[PDB]
Paper text:
As a member of the Embecovirus, HKU1 uses a primary glycan-based receptor (9-O-acetylated sialosides) and a secondary proteinaceous receptor for host cell targeting and membrane fusion. One unique feature of HKU1 spike is that the C-terminal domain (CTD) of S1 (also known as receptor-binding domain, RBD) is exceptionally larger than other CoV RBDs, and the receptor-binding motif (RBM) of HKU1 adopts a unique fold. Proteinaceous receptor of HKU1 was identified as transmembrane serine protease 2 (TMPRSS2) and HKU1 RBD binds TMPRSS2 with nanomolar affinity. The TMPRSS2–RBD interaction occurred between a groove formed on the HKU1 RBD apex and a hydrophobic surface near the active site in the C-terminal trypsin-like serine peptidase (SP) domain of TMPRSS2.
Using bio-layer interferometry (BLI), we determined the equilibrium dissociation constant (KD) for RBD–TMPRSS2 interaction. The affinity of 1A-RBD–TMPRSS2 (KD = 323 nM) was ~2-fold lower than that of 1B-RBD–TMPRSS2 (KD = 170 nM), which is consistent with the KD values reported previously. Reconstruction of 1A-RBD–TMPRSS2 particles yielded poor EM densities, whereas reconstruction of 1B-RBD–TMPRSS2 particles yielded clearer densities, despite the resolution of 1A-RBD–TMPRSS2 map estimated by gold-standard Fourier shell (3.34 Å) is similar to that for 1B-RBD–TMPRSS2 map (3.95 Å). Given that high-resolution crystal structures of HKU1A RBD and TMPRSS2 were separately determined by our group and other groups, we fitted the HKU1A RBD and TMPRSS2 atomic model into our HKU1A RBD–TMPRSS2 EM density map by rigid body fitting. The fitting was unambiguous and the models fitted the EM density well. To investigate whether the binding mode of TMPRSS2 with 1A-RBD and 1B-RBD, and the regions involved in the TMPRSS2–RBD interaction are similar, we superimposed two structures, giving an overall RMSD (Cα atoms) value of 1.3 Å. Further, we compared the structures of interaction regions in 1 A and 1B RBD that directly contact TMPRSS2, which gave an RMSD of 0.9 Å, confirming that this region adopts a similar fold despite amino acid variances between HKU1 1 A and 1B. Except four residues on apex of β-hairpin (residues 509–512) which have minor shifts, all other interaction residues are nearly superimposable. Thus, the difference between 1A and 1B RBD in receptor binding affinity most likely stems from variation in the side chains of amino acids. Variations D511Y and H512V between 1A and 1B RBD may alter hydrophobic packing interaction; variations S487K and T507D between 1A and 1B RBD may affect salt bridging contacts, which on the whole results in different receptor binding affinity.
Author numbering:
A (entry chain A): 322 to 610
B (entry chain B): 129 to 492
């Protein structure tokens, strides 16, 4: 009634489609929507609702509709089943099973869609990461996520490393207010300056997690990935003084891979529908008179 | 000693190469070195009596000890077997052996020169760091060696007369057997005081032992009085070449070591389960930077919290296989106690199994 349309269809078919690492989310409110028009305008593969009725969606009023979208890899299609523990569900996006939700399977042609990859972790971009140097129509997904606090450094103290004859790690200067990397020195069998540090191999391959500063984490409902591997033995350069900055190279970041989204010259994108306030609100539906 | 089993005849009679004998496999299949083909071949059960087993165990550095001997089905896949003959009037077994394609009984000899590798049943024993109390009788081969009536290094027995341990404990000026005193079969260190000692008559050290890299770390203490075997003191069988020691295999370590680094030694004997670490995994630039010689073994957990300590040196590294315990490692040294990335480092007994026999026969 004297109030415009939701234009949900215009948002899903946008040529800019993000990745499960950086899945977007838009909130629809106080607008008119049509699921039948959405069904015919966009080529939808599957449409299943969890703990909800498909027939009651038509001509129903809600409070707000929460949407998600990200192009899906071909390898981890099996991760989207409810209750799974795949890479996408344990590190990229966890589906709200309790709430009344509907899962949308829609696709766009590959001749116009442009994929976007972004790193949501703050400390990931702080310590060297810039962007993803990936191919066209490439979807970046995270194997695991590591959660660190504000006082974490991947670079050791240069003063400590000045006396490490053997296995001297690359060193640099932390930003002020942060705590330096944990390291210790011993000596075994004529290795008078033997030096070892925590999280020495890849943090997934790190045998002792308690002494490791990086802690693995599970993604929740609405949260994003905590971080990457960010191997510390490649962060910085050798014989680095305080004039250099604690920066990790591109190859230091681990715990992620990629796969394409094409399927019969058509890129597939997963969408999740969350409905709030059934038989309430003002964003009603005009599927029935 | 070192002239034994080297492929070169030293004595004019050639007993060095004709009498090279060793066991094989977890089922103790006997082998005899063939000088004509420079290879080890098993023996047949055909026309064999226990009097020959007496001589076999005598030449195997076990003197008159002889537990049992029976025939078993061949499992090593050997193409040739030694065959005995009763037509010869001589009393030496090795001149009676000749090559044959197969035995008529389709069996090979399982030789046991000493009753070893068996202990009383024990349920809960993880007394090394992070565990619960132990029970007597589960580790009867474990003994403690004392200098001035205080503990220095542990020890394990293989015969009533011999005790094996690490060479760094017997290093100079502690190379005199008069200072050493061994106690056998006592769990509490407060009880090995009054008359329980077994003095060492002569200490044996590895000729190629080097203290800079602490490699070839082996030592053999010999007592004047042979140990009288009972339930509380039993030997452990020396492992044989040819066992497929799988990675991660559940092994047991024991000793009177400390519960933490730089701490005092434990009042009671401690023993807990650890796991094998592959040598190529350990000698990388990461774990010890090529510090592990082929005569060295890495055992324990890379995550730590279960490892040897000071005072655990000389202890046994034992595993269970076919209800028989095998002394595969000796505690040489350990970088820290119960710590990650720096597990326990053990000396490889398997490389020195023949050297032990070389010292056994010449000191019989």
């Amino acid at each position: 009634p004297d109030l415009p349309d939701c234009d949900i269809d215009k948002w899903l078919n946008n040529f800019n489609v993000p990745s499960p690492l950086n899945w977007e989310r838009k909130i629809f409110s106080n607008c008119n929507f049509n699921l039948s028009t959405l069904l015919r305008l966009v080529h939808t593969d599957s449409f299943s609702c969890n703990n909800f009725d498909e027939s009651k969606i038509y001509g129903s009023c809600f409070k707000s509709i929460v949407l998600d979208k990200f192009a899906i890899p071909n390898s981890r299609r099996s991760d989207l089943q409810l209750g799974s523990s795949g890479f996408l569900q344990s590190s990229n996006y966890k589906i709200d099973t309790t709430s009344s939700s509907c899962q949308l399977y829609y696709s766009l042609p590959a001749i116009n869609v442009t994929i976007n990859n972004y790193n949501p972790s703050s400390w990931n971009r702080r310590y060297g990461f810039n962007n993803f140097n990936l191919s066209s129509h490439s979807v970046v997904y995270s194997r695991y996520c590591f959660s660190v606090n504000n006082t974490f450094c991947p670079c050791a103290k240069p003063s400590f490393a000045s006396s490490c004859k053997s296995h001297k790690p690359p060193s640099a200067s932390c930003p002020i207010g942060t705590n330096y990397r944990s390291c210790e020195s011993t000596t075994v069998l004529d290795h008078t300056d033997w030096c070892r540090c925590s999280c020495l191999p890849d943090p997934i391959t790190a045998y002792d997690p308690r002494s490791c500063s990086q802690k693995k984490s599970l993604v929740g409902v609405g949260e994003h990935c905590a971080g990457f591997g960010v191997d510390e033995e490649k962060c910085g350069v050798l014989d680095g003084s305080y004039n250099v900055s604690c920066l990790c190279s591109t190859d230091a970041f681990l715990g992620w891979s990629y796969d394409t989204c094409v399927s019969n010259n058509r890129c597939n994108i997963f969408s999740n529908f969350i409905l709030n306030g059934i038989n309430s609100g003002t964003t009603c539906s005009n599927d029935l008179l | 000693p070192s002239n034994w089993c080297d492929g070169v005849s030293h004595c004019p009679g050639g007993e060095d190469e004709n009498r090279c004998v060793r066991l094989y496999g977890p089922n103790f299949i006997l082998q005899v070195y063939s000088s004509q083909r420079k290879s080890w071949h098993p023996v047949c059960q055909d026309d064999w009596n226990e009097n020959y087993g007496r001589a076999a165990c005598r030449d195997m550095g076990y003197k008159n000890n002889f537990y049992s001997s029976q025939g078993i089905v061949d499992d090593s896949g050997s193409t040739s077997f030694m065959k005995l003959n009763t037509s010869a009037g001589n009393v030496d077994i090795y001149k009676k052996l000749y090559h044959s394609d197969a035995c008529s009984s389709k069996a090979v000899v399982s030789l046991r020169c000493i009753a070893c590798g068996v202990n009383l049943n024990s349920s809960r024993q993880s007394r090394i760091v992070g565990g619960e109390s132990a029970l007597p009788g589960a580790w009867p081969w474990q003994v403690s060696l004392h200098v001035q009536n205080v503990h220095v290094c542990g020890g394990s027995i293989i015969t009533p007369e011999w005790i094996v341990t690490a060479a760094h404990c017997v290093e100079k000026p502690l190379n005199n057997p008069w200072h050493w005193t061994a106690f056998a079969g006592i769990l509490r260190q407060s009880f090995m005081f009054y008359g329980a000692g077994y003095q060492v008559e002569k200490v044996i050290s590895h000729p190629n032992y080097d203290s800079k890299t602490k490699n070839n770390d082996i030592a053999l203490m010999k007592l004047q009085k042979p140990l009288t075997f009972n339930d509380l003191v039993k030997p452990v069988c020396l492992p044989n070449p040819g066992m497929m020691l799988q990675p991660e295999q559940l092994c047991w370590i024991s000793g009177w070591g400390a519960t933490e680094e730089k701490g005092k030694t434990s009042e009671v004997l401690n023993a807990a389960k650890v796991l094998l670490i592959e040598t190529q995994r350990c000698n990388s630039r990461y774990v010890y930077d090529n510090l592990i010689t082929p005569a060295m073994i890495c055992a324990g957990f890379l995550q730590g919290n279960v490892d040897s300590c000071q005072g655990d040196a000389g202890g046994p590294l034992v595993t269970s296989k076919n209800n028989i315990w095998w002394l595969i490692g000796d505690t040489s040294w350990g970088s820290g106690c119960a710590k990650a990335y720096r597990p326990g480092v053990y000396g490889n007994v398997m490389v020195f199994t023949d050297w032990i026999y070389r010292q056994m026969r010449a000191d019989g």
